[PDB]
Amino acid sequence: PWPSNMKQFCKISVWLQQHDPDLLEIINNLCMLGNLSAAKYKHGVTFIYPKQAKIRDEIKKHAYSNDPSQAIKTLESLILPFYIPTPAEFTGEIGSYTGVKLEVEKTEANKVILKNGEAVLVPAADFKPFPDRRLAVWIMESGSMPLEGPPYK
Amino acid sequence: PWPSNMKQFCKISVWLQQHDPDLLEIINNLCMLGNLSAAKYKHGVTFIYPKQAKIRDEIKKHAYSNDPSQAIKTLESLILPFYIPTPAEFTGEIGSYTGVKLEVEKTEANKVILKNGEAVLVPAADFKPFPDRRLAVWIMESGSMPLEGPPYK
Amino acid sequence: PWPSNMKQFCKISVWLQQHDPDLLEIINNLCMLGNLSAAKYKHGVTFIYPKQAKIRDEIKKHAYSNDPSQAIKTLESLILPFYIPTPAEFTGEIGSYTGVKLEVEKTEANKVILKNGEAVLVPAADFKPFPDRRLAVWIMESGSMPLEGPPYK
Amino acid sequence: PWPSNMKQFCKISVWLQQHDPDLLEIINNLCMLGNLSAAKYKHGVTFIYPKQAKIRDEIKKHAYSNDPSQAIKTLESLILPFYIPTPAEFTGEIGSYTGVKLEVEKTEANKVILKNGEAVLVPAADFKPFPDRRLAVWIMESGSMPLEGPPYK
Amino acid sequence: PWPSNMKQFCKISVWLQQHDPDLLEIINNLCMLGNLSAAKYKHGVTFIYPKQAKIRDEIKKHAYSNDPSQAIKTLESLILPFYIPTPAEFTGEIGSYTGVKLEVEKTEANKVILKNGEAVLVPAADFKPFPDRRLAVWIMESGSMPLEGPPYK
Amino acid sequence: PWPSNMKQFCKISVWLQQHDPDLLEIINNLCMLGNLSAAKYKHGVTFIYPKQAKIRDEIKKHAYSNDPSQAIKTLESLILPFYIPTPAEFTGEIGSYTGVKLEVEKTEANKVILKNGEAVLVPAADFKPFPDRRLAVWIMESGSMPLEGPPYK
């Protein structure tokens, strides 16, 4: 009824449960849940959620295929072992669980645009972590996250 | 995965399930499923879906309340025992289950703005009925549907 | 969360779902949902809910058994094609789906003890029908409902 | 646990749920549940279940496609408005919802091979109806049911 | 059917799943599942289940609010990082995951009453752990667990 | 629809979810999920799935009884803390989570037969792990896995 969803999240999965459960089920079925989770010695986690259903559908198609490794690498490109809560923080030697270094083309107050795919990233308006949870969620509005390229140090 | 949602529909409930399952459960729990279904005698069914969760949540609050009569009336005003696929057919003595006559203020080829609540209705971009099934679903972007007023004939 | 259960009811099944969903599934699986529903011709429906899980479990054992005819008979004896809201109306030629006439031993303003099984019935504290819907639900605290005996007229 | 599946059935859908819940959901989503149910006027219902997932998957692909009319036709050819419990009753002017007359090539006491698709039908080892309920379920091991051909009378 | 629930639990969540699933879902959604779980270097776990639905509902209201931290502290006050299986064991420097030390007012053979909230605690009759699982579950029948006060050493 | 199941599994639970969910739920409810999971310092995991529903049903009966320890030991006898992908690998000092050493009676290209229960084991045709996942799943077609006997070193 009136209390559908959570408004503050201690984990990114609770947020993803409320937006694309199927995507979360595939993240779990491919043993990638650990990648979403904040662990000590890891900087924190930032997740890139594809707004466009065509991109998410393609991950699903591949995840249920005879070669799901294509879904693993797309998924690895959407998860950053860094805490990147704002556009200002989206700089330096950072990248996804593919080792690829992300390069910012244009940076705006509430938007980041990336080289190598022209991904348009905006912070997810309804993802609010707890204080001292180092979690972030961005919506990818268009383009694609980089799959290949030179890595970060 | 990729095949999640039906593209064509023989009942509105199957559409509703893909958009607001909670709203569909409440409709069923209030013995109002029959109001969404094409009987022989009944011309057809048009359902108005409130886009702003504010309105859908308020229906859910009232449905699980000690007096659910207000949820029933709101739902009655969102179900039309007439087949109104486009704005051109939105004219004459047509109304909801409440019986209040609908009075259109402006039409706009794909948009309809009604008097008595200033409801703004746009056909649903993902609802196509089976042929020979007189079912329509509109999205109410803003405003509200008429609750009381002169009856239609 | 806070809004979990409906406070008012237009069908007994919605009440049953909040108390014993398994029992409701078995009722449906045995094509006995219709027996809980107010038809035009039928006076009303009163359902007797067995409080002791012992009796509900025994119905479930028998329902999934190779001969479910005994589950059907027990369920028949717990559904009454009459609207009996309080002990005062618990009199005359009234009975269950089996057809055995119910004979009250003691009434007690909010309690009814029947002959032929020593069933102890108390109205359900959380079942209120919509007005003009002739639906009642009693809790059988002990005893059992009549299985066989002289029919009512 | 141990009591999971019903051993006797008053409706085919309860059997289908224990074997292919997805197929049952699609049947319901296509307003074809009524075709599996014994009406007064209708003689009885026999349902043909495709054993090879290849055929059931192809129905699901077509059901969620932009033209589900082909799923409807396949399902029509698997539902028989006649009560055909054994091979001996598989004769005369009997057919599916499509209306094509079924022509048996070989019978074999517990096996039936039809013309016009070479369907191989064997009664389902776990479907027993309630007595006085004219319901049958066969397993199609190979082949396909007739889609088009001369009608039965 | 007849085997509804587990009778012996290796974790407290299996017990809570059978009594208040929603409460368990909120415990998981707030990353408090670890607190219920026995870990080496932790004494063991004791969980206080509020019998009264009004208390549990308030946790839910707060958990789905803009400030769920109120639900976290109520939940922390219901979980004890100690193994406290009987009234005799409910003594000494013990308390919840708020640091607050619990003080016993009256101790009975099957009941404990606490200062600072007048909580009435009785061992949950259907919670039986495995041998050498250091798990306990009490029902809080009335009053409240302490939220604030001097801590244990 | 067409993408029912996963074709490649990073965990054995995803496979078991697609064949006996209830068995998986009981494995989780008895805190035996960890045994299915590959951990560093553990060789790998091999799971023996009983083809025969009578064996799996007996585990369920016992798991929901007052003494579920009988289900724990049967379950321990079905899980091997070794990676055993083929018949050639099924030799040496290996066994289940009971310490009992498995002895091969007859070994075939696609089948292994065991002493002390005459278990007939065949690799599960639809279990394909990822490269460098050390996971295997066999179907036990008849007989039983050893419960008692001399242990492996």
CSV table of N, CA and C in Angstrom, one decimal, chain C residues 25-134:
chain,number,residue,atom,x,y,z
C,25,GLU,N,-5.8,-22.2,-0.7
C,25,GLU,CA,-5.3,-22.9,-2.0
C,25,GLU,C,-6.0,-24.2,-2.1
C,26,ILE,N,-6.1,-24.9,-1.0
C,26,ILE,CA,-6.8,-26.3,-1.1
C,26,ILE,C,-8.3,-26.1,-1.5
C,27,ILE,N,-9.0,-25.2,-0.8
C,27,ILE,CA,-10.3,-24.9,-1.2
C,27,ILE,C,-10.5,-24.6,-2.7
C,28,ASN,N,-9.5,-23.8,-3.2
C,28,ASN,CA,-9.6,-23.6,-4.7
C,28,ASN,C,-9.2,-24.8,-5.5
C,29,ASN,N,-8.2,-25.6,-5.0
C,29,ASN,CA,-7.8,-26.8,-5.8
C,29,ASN,C,-8.9,-27.8,-5.8
C,30,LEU,N,-9.8,-27.8,-4.9
C,30,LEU,CA,-10.9,-28.8,-4.8
C,30,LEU,C,-12.2,-28.2,-5.4
C,31,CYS,N,-12.1,-27.2,-6.2
C,31,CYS,CA,-13.3,-26.5,-6.9
C,31,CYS,C,-14.4,-26.2,-5.9
C,32,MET,N,-14.0,-25.7,-4.7
C,32,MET,CA,-14.9,-25.3,-3.7
C,32,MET,C,-14.9,-23.8,-3.4
C,33,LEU,N,-14.3,-23.0,-4.2
C,33,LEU,CA,-14.3,-21.6,-4.0
C,33,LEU,C,-15.7,-21.1,-4.2
C,34,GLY,N,-16.5,-21.6,-5.1
C,34,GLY,CA,-17.8,-21.2,-5.3
C,34,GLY,C,-18.7,-21.3,-4.1
C,35,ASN,N,-18.3,-22.2,-3.2
C,35,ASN,CA,-19.2,-22.5,-2.0
C,35,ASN,C,-19.0,-21.4,-1.0
C,36,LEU,N,-18.0,-20.6,-1.1
C,36,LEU,CA,-17.7,-19.5,-0.2
C,36,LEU,C,-18.3,-18.1,-0.7
C,37,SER,N,-19.0,-18.1,-1.9
C,37,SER,CA,-19.3,-16.9,-2.5
C,37,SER,C,-20.8,-16.7,-2.6
C,38,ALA,N,-21.2,-15.5,-2.5
C,38,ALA,CA,-22.6,-15.2,-2.4
C,38,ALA,C,-23.2,-15.1,-3.8
C,39,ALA,N,-24.0,-16.2,-4.2
C,39,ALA,CA,-24.8,-16.1,-5.4
C,39,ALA,C,-26.1,-15.4,-5.1
C,40,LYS,N,-26.7,-14.9,-6.2
C,40,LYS,CA,-28.0,-14.3,-6.1
C,40,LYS,C,-29.0,-15.2,-5.3
C,41,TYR,N,-29.2,-16.4,-5.8
C,41,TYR,CA,-30.2,-17.3,-5.2
C,41,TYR,C,-29.8,-17.6,-3.8
C,42,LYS,N,-28.5,-17.8,-3.5
C,42,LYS,CA,-28.1,-18.2,-2.2
C,42,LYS,C,-28.2,-17.1,-1.1
C,43,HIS,N,-28.7,-17.5,0.0
C,43,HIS,CA,-29.1,-16.5,1.1
C,43,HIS,C,-27.8,-15.7,1.5
C,44,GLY,N,-26.7,-16.4,1.7
C,44,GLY,CA,-25.5,-15.8,2.3
C,44,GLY,C,-24.6,-16.9,2.6
C,45,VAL,N,-23.4,-16.5,3.0
C,45,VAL,CA,-22.4,-17.5,3.4
C,45,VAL,C,-21.8,-17.2,4.7
C,46,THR,N,-21.7,-18.3,5.5
C,46,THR,CA,-21.1,-18.3,6.8
C,46,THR,C,-20.0,-19.4,6.7
C,47,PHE,N,-18.8,-19.0,7.1
C,47,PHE,CA,-17.7,-19.9,7.1
C,47,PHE,C,-17.2,-20.2,8.5
C,48,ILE,N,-16.9,-21.4,8.8
C,48,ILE,CA,-16.4,-21.8,10.2
C,48,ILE,C,-14.9,-22.1,10.0
C,49,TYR,N,-14.1,-21.4,10.7
C,49,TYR,CA,-12.6,-21.6,10.6
C,49,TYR,C,-12.1,-22.4,11.8
C,50,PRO,N,-11.5,-23.5,11.5
C,50,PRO,CA,-11.0,-24.3,12.7
C,50,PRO,C,-9.7,-23.7,13.3
C,51,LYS,N,-9.8,-23.3,14.5
C,51,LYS,CA,-8.7,-22.6,15.2
C,51,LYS,C,-7.5,-23.6,15.4
C,52,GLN,N,-7.8,-24.8,15.8
C,52,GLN,CA,-6.7,-25.7,16.1
C,52,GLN,C,-6.1,-26.3,14.8
C,53,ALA,N,-4.8,-25.9,14.6
C,53,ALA,CA,-4.1,-26.4,13.4
C,53,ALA,C,-4.2,-27.9,13.2
C,54,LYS,N,-4.4,-28.6,14.3
C,54,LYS,CA,-4.7,-30.1,14.1
C,54,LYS,C,-5.7,-30.4,13.1
C,55,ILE,N,-6.9,-29.7,13.2
C,55,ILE,CA,-8.0,-29.9,12.3
C,55,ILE,C,-7.7,-29.4,10.9
C,56,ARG,N,-7.0,-28.2,10.7
C,56,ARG,CA,-6.7,-27.7,9.4
C,56,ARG,C,-5.6,-28.6,8.8
C,57,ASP,N,-4.6,-29.1,9.5
C,57,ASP,CA,-3.6,-30.0,9.0
C,57,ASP,C,-4.2,-31.3,8.5
C,58,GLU,N,-5.1,-31.8,9.3
C,58,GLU,CA,-5.8,-33.1,8.8
C,58,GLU,C,-6.5,-32.9,7.5
C,59,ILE,N,-7.1,-31.7,7.3
C,59,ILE,CA,-7.8,-31.4,6.0
C,59,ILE,C,-6.7,-31.4,4.9
C,60,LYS,N,-5.5,-30.9,5.2
C,60,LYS,CA,-4.5,-30.8,4.1
C,60,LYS,C,-3.9,-32.1,3.8
C,61,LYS,N,-3.6,-32.9,4.8
C,61,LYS,CA,-3.2,-34.3,4.5
C,61,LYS,C,-4.2,-35.0,3.6
C,62,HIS,N,-5.5,-35.0,4.0
C,62,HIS,CA,-6.5,-35.6,3.2
C,62,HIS,C,-6.7,-35.0,1.8
C,63,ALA,N,-6.4,-33.7,1.6
C,63,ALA,CA,-6.6,-33.1,0.3
C,63,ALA,C,-5.6,-33.6,-0.7
C,64,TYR,N,-4.4,-33.8,-0.3
C,64,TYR,CA,-3.3,-34.2,-1.1
C,64,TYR,C,-3.2,-35.7,-1.1
C,65,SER,N,-4.1,-36.4,-0.5
C,65,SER,CA,-4.1,-37.9,-0.5
C,65,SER,C,-4.7,-38.4,-1.7
C,66,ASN,N,-4.6,-39.8,-1.9
C,66,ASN,CA,-5.2,-40.4,-3.1
C,66,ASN,C,-6.7,-40.4,-3.1
C,67,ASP,N,-7.3,-40.3,-1.9
C,67,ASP,CA,-8.8,-40.1,-1.8
C,67,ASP,C,-9.1,-38.8,-1.1
C,68,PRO,N,-9.3,-37.7,-1.8
C,68,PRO,CA,-9.5,-36.4,-1.2
C,68,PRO,C,-11.0,-36.2,-0.8
C,69,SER,N,-11.8,-37.3,-1.0
C,69,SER,CA,-13.3,-37.1,-0.7
C,69,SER,C,-13.6,-36.7,0.7
C,70,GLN,N,-12.7,-37.1,1.7
C,70,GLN,CA,-12.8,-36.8,3.1
C,70,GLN,C,-12.5,-35.3,3.4
C,71,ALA,N,-11.5,-34.7,2.7
C,71,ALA,CA,-11.3,-33.3,2.8
C,71,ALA,C,-12.5,-32.5,2.3
C,72,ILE,N,-13.1,-32.9,1.2
C,72,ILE,CA,-14.2,-32.3,0.6
C,72,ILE,C,-15.4,-32.3,1.6
C,73,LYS,N,-15.6,-33.4,2.3
C,73,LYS,CA,-16.7,-33.5,3.2
C,73,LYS,C,-16.5,-32.6,4.4
C,74,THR,N,-15.3,-32.6,5.0
C,74,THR,CA,-15.0,-31.7,6.1
C,74,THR,C,-15.2,-30.3,5.7
C,75,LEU,N,-14.7,-29.9,4.6
C,75,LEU,CA,-14.9,-28.5,4.1
C,75,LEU,C,-16.3,-28.2,3.9
C,76,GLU,N,-17.1,-29.1,3.4
C,76,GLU,CA,-18.5,-28.9,3.2
C,76,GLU,C,-19.2,-28.6,4.5
C,77,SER,N,-18.8,-29.3,5.6
C,77,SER,CA,-19.4,-29.1,6.9
C,77,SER,C,-18.9,-27.8,7.6
C,78,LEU,N,-18.0,-27.1,7.0
C,78,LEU,CA,-17.5,-25.8,7.6
C,78,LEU,C,-18.1,-24.6,6.8
C,79,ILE,N,-18.9,-24.8,5.8
C,79,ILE,CA,-19.4,-23.7,4.9
C,79,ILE,C,-20.9,-23.8,5.0
C,80,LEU,N,-21.5,-22.7,5.2
C,80,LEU,CA,-23.0,-22.7,5.5
C,80,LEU,C,-23.6,-21.8,4.5
C,81,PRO,N,-24.6,-22.3,3.7
C,81,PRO,CA,-25.2,-21.4,2.7
C,81,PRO,C,-26.3,-20.6,3.3
C,82,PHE,N,-26.0,-20.0,4.5
C,82,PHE,CA,-26.8,-19.1,5.2
C,82,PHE,C,-26.0,-18.0,5.8
C,83,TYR,N,-26.6,-16.8,6.0
C,83,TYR,CA,-25.9,-15.7,6.6
C,83,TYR,C,-26.2,-15.7,8.1
C,84,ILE,N,-25.3,-16.1,8.9
C,84,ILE,CA,-25.5,-16.2,10.4
C,84,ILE,C,-24.4,-15.3,11.1
C,85,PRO,N,-24.7,-14.0,11.2
C,85,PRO,CA,-23.7,-13.1,11.8
C,85,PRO,C,-23.5,-13.2,13.3
C,86,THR,N,-24.6,-13.5,14.1
C,86,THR,CA,-24.5,-13.6,15.5
C,86,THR,C,-25.3,-14.8,16.0
C,87,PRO,N,-25.2,-15.2,17.3
C,87,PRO,CA,-25.8,-16.4,17.9
C,87,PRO,C,-27.4,-16.3,17.8
C,88,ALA,N,-28.0,-15.1,17.9
C,88,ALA,CA,-29.4,-15.0,17.8
C,88,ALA,C,-30.0,-15.6,16.5
C,89,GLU,N,-29.2,-15.4,15.4
C,89,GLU,CA,-29.6,-15.9,14.0
C,89,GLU,C,-29.3,-17.4,13.9
C,90,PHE,N,-28.6,-18.0,14.9
C,90,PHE,CA,-28.2,-19.4,14.8
C,90,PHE,C,-29.3,-20.3,15.3
C,91,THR,N,-30.4,-20.3,14.5
C,91,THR,CA,-31.6,-21.2,14.9
C,91,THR,C,-32.4,-21.5,13.7
C,92,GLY,N,-33.4,-22.4,13.9
C,92,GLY,CA,-34.2,-22.8,12.7
C,92,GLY,C,-33.6,-23.9,11.9
C,93,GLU,N,-34.1,-24.1,10.6
C,93,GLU,CA,-33.6,-25.1,9.7
C,93,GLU,C,-32.4,-24.5,8.9
C,94,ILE,N,-31.3,-24.4,9.6
C,94,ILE,CA,-30.0,-23.9,9.0
C,94,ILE,C,-29.0,-25.0,9.1
C,95,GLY,N,-28.2,-25.1,8.0
C,95,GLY,CA,-27.1,-26.2,8.0
C,95,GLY,C,-26.0,-25.9,7.1
C,96,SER,N,-25.0,-26.8,7.0
C,96,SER,CA,-23.8,-26.7,6.1
C,96,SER,C,-24.1,-27.3,4.8
C,97,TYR,N,-23.1,-27.4,3.9
C,97,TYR,CA,-23.2,-28.0,2.6
C,97,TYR,C,-23.5,-29.5,2.6
C,98,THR,N,-23.2,-30.2,3.7
C,98,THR,CA,-23.5,-31.6,3.9
C,98,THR,C,-25.0,-31.7,4.0
C,99,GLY,N,-25.7,-30.8,4.6
C,99,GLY,CA,-27.2,-30.8,4.7
C,99,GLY,C,-27.7,-31.2,6.1
C,100,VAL,N,-26.7,-31.6,7.0
C,100,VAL,CA,-27.1,-32.0,8.4
C,100,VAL,C,-27.6,-30.7,9.1
C,101,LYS,N,-28.8,-30.9,9.8
C,101,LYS,CA,-29.3,-29.7,10.5
C,101,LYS,C,-28.5,-29.4,11.7
C,102,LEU,N,-28.2,-28.1,12.0
C,102,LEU,CA,-27.4,-27.7,13.1
C,102,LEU,C,-28.3,-27.5,14.3
C,103,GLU,N,-27.9,-28.1,15.5
C,103,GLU,CA,-28.7,-28.0,16.7
C,103,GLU,C,-27.9,-27.4,17.8
C,104,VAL,N,-28.2,-26.2,18.2
C,104,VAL,CA,-27.4,-25.4,19.2
C,104,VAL,C,-27.7,-25.9,20.6
C,105,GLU,N,-26.7,-26.2,21.4
C,105,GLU,CA,-26.9,-26.6,22.8
C,105,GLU,C,-26.9,-25.4,23.7
C,106,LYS,N,-26.0,-24.5,23.6
C,106,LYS,CA,-26.0,-23.3,24.5
C,106,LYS,C,-25.6,-22.1,23.6
C,107,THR,N,-26.3,-21.0,23.8
C,107,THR,CA,-25.8,-19.8,23.3
C,107,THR,C,-25.4,-18.9,24.4
C,108,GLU,N,-24.6,-17.9,24.1
C,108,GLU,CA,-24.0,-17.1,25.1
C,108,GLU,C,-23.6,-15.7,24.6
C,109,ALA,N,-24.5,-15.1,23.8
C,109,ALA,CA,-24.4,-13.7,23.3
C,109,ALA,C,-23.3,-13.5,22.3
C,110,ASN,N,-22.2,-14.1,22.6
C,110,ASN,CA,-21.1,-14.1,21.6
C,110,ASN,C,-20.5,-15.5,21.4
C,111,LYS,N,-21.1,-16.5,22.0
C,111,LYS,CA,-20.6,-17.9,21.9
C,111,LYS,C,-21.7,-18.8,21.5
C,112,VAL,N,-21.5,-19.8,20.7
C,112,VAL,CA,-22.5,-20.8,20.3
C,112,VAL,C,-21.8,-22.2,20.4
C,113,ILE,N,-22.5,-23.1,21.2
C,113,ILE,CA,-22.0,-24.5,21.3
C,113,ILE,C,-23.1,-25.4,20.7
C,114,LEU,N,-22.7,-26.1,19.7
C,114,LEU,CA,-23.6,-26.9,18.9
C,114,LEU,C,-23.6,-28.4,19.4
C,115,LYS,N,-24.8,-29.0,19.2
C,115,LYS,CA,-24.8,-30.5,19.4
C,115,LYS,C,-24.1,-31.2,18.2
C,116,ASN,N,-23.8,-32.5,18.4
C,116,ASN,CA,-23.3,-33.4,17.4
C,116,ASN,C,-21.9,-33.0,17.0
C,117,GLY,N,-21.0,-33.0,17.9
C,117,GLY,CA,-19.6,-32.6,17.7
C,117,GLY,C,-19.1,-31.7,18.8
C,118,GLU,N,-20.0,-31.0,19.5
C,118,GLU,CA,-19.7,-30.1,20.6
C,118,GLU,C,-18.8,-28.9,20.1
C,119,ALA,N,-19.1,-28.5,18.9
C,119,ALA,CA,-18.3,-27.3,18.3
C,119,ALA,C,-18.6,-26.1,19.1
C,120,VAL,N,-17.5,-25.3,19.4
C,120,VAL,CA,-17.6,-24.1,20.1
C,120,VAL,C,-17.3,-22.9,19.2
C,121,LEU,N,-18.2,-22.1,18.8
C,121,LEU,CA,-18.1,-21.1,17.8
C,121,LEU,C,-18.2,-19.7,18.4
C,122,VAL,N,-17.2,-18.9,18.0
C,122,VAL,CA,-17.2,-17.5,18.4
C,122,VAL,C,-16.9,-16.7,17.2
C,123,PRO,N,-17.7,-15.6,17.0
C,123,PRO,CA,-17.4,-14.8,15.8
C,123,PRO,C,-16.0,-14.3,15.7
C,124,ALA,N,-15.5,-14.2,14.4
C,124,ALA,CA,-14.1,-13.8,14.2
C,124,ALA,C,-13.9,-12.3,14.6
C,125,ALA,N,-12.9,-12.1,15.4
C,125,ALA,CA,-12.7,-10.7,15.9
C,125,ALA,C,-12.2,-9.7,14.8
C,126,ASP,N,-11.7,-10.2,13.7
C,126,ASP,CA,-11.2,-9.4,12.6
C,126,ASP,C,-12.0,-9.6,11.3
C,127,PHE,N,-13.2,-10.0,11.3
C,127,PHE,CA,-14.0,-10.1,10.1
C,127,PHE,C,-15.3,-9.2,10.2
C,128,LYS,N,-15.3,-8.1,9.4
C,128,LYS,CA,-16.4,-7.3,9.3
C,128,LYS,C,-16.8,-7.2,7.8
C,129,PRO,N,-18.0,-7.6,7.3
C,129,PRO,CA,-18.3,-7.5,5.9
C,129,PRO,C,-18.6,-6.0,5.5
C,130,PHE,N,-18.5,-5.8,4.2
C,130,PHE,CA,-19.2,-4.6,3.7
C,130,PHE,C,-20.6,-4.7,4.0
C,131,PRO,N,-21.3,-3.5,4.2
C,131,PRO,CA,-22.7,-3.5,4.4
C,131,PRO,C,-23.4,-4.1,3.2
C,132,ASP,N,-24.6,-4.7,3.4
C,132,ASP,CA,-25.3,-5.3,2.3
C,132,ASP,C,-24.6,-6.5,1.7
C,133,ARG,N,-23.6,-7.0,2.4
C,133,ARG,CA,-23.0,-8.3,1.9
C,133,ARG,C,-23.1,-9.3,3.1
C,134,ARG,N,-23.9,-10.4,2.8
C,134,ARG,CA,-24.3,-11.3,3.8
C,134,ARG,C,-23.3,-12.4,4.0
